[PDB]
From Swiss-Prot, chains A, B:
Pfam families, sorted: THF_DHG_CYH, THF_DHG_CYH_C
HAMAP family from the UniProt entry: THF_DHG_CYH
GO biological process, one term: tetrahydrofolate interconversion
Family recorded in the similarity comment: Belongs to the tetrahydrofolate dehydrogenase/cyclohydrolase family.
CDD domains in alphabetical order: NAD_bind_m-THF_DH_Cyclohyd (cd01080)
Sequence positions that bind NADP(+): G165, A166, S167, I231
EC number, UniProt record: 1.5.1.5, 3.5.4.9
Pathway annotation from the record: One-carbon metabolism; tetrahydrofolate interconversion
Protein name: Bifunctional protein FolD
Amino acid sequence: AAKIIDGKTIAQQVRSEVAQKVQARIAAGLRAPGLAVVLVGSNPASQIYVASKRKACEEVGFVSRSYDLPETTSEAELLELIDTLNADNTIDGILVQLPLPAGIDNVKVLERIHPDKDVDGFHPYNVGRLCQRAPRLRPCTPRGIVTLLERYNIDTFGLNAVVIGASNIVGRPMSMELLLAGCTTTVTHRFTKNLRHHVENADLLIVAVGKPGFIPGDWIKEGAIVIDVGINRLENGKVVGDVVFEDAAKRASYITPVPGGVGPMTVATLIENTLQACVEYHDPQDE
Amino acid sequence: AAKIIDGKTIAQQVRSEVAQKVQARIAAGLRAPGLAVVLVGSNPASQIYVASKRKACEEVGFVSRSYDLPETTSEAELLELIDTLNADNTIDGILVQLPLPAGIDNVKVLERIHPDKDVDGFHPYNVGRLCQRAPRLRPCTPRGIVTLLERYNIDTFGLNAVVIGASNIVGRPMSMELLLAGCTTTVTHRFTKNLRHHVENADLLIVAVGKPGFIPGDWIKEGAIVIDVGINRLENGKVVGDVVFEDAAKRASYITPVPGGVGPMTVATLIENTLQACVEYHDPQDE
């Protein structure tokens, strides 16, 4: 009888907290945090993403500096905008939505953003810092998952955790983030032999493969904590995770639902990091 | 009957290769790679380190730009030197020996070095790049270990590897480096519960705790590959690793001796990275 990890509610709480802190700032004569979202092209999926980020943002009281550019804009133009965005004291965060037009150097563009404005946590600088136990702006998804564990009073130290994934956006930073929490981390991927074995002993599971029902609830260790990051929209209209909820729910002790688990935490965390970049790096109120 | 991984010889080969490539350069009218070693203070251990690096360096044909500064030099002076070193086209690498005087911001100084000159692989930028499967200048020790596996024709893909350590200098980058090689990585540390269990299944072991005989050869999985990074100089004059060589040698298939295993690879790799920084980043001969 697994306990539900209401990511929807927790994210609501996190959004609420950032709101108060913004009200406090304005009431004291201080500017509000400013996020800049740069959407290039017209990918329908990107539209729903950029809109959901822009909504939470205006909901907490930030200043929105939205830029909807054409799919034609050159790399020199996209970089020029970023240089200008880095030099603006009103802007604390810069979020350049992906995918970006093919032909544009993806890394040259993303890395052009100053790390202190890198609210998504992509820049290799903030990534290295996370690895070297000295975190700055941390990757949204992994950080969101850590917050989840915190809000439910889960002792992470000494836990044997397995991360099925190993990606740049989730798996890899997930491991670094879990070590910083005192977990014995194990990262699996495609070359992994006998995946069932590693999952068998894991006290904390974190799935991120992007394949519906990929991990049978059969494999989950009785008492484990399941964190399903996958969101697979089946052709019959249903939305399921990388794990078989029904079975896994019986074995597990805590589990994230899909949707309403990890998803709403990724956006909450972005908001959170924007606040952090303002309060600590761009306009801090020192003692 | 374990096979010996002669790190002493392999390192000799690596040093030889960098030599040839430097001769080729000079013979074609091109400058040689230049390394700058900055030793501050008078720690006897640091002296033997900086001397061993300066020797290999002159042995391969690099230009030595040594700086032996007093333990009194200020942080503003140490930074001033680095800015100047970054702007010198003759210098491809900058190695600021540690420990540095207490009172000097260790990170502010090390990070002041341009990543393209960071031949040790410390800067969070080169670390992030390693994590994001897009490596630039890689950390010396972990990279040296990968070279060891290569030179002995060891198939790393699909191997179950355990890294006993989790440090900024070895453990953490070791994991990132092993994933890039296709190993299912597991990183242990002090909070790890039942360490014997994880070691029991590991096909590739990598010990870095700094405690003599910490891992009994009893625990090693028959057929495993032992990589002992530890170098503990006992008070009786003897030098041993973190593993019990006698016992472990019987079980294992391949094993690194102490000394003459990993140690000589750390310096070989630094040399290698210096060459790489010259040939690719500072003075490349493009098509």
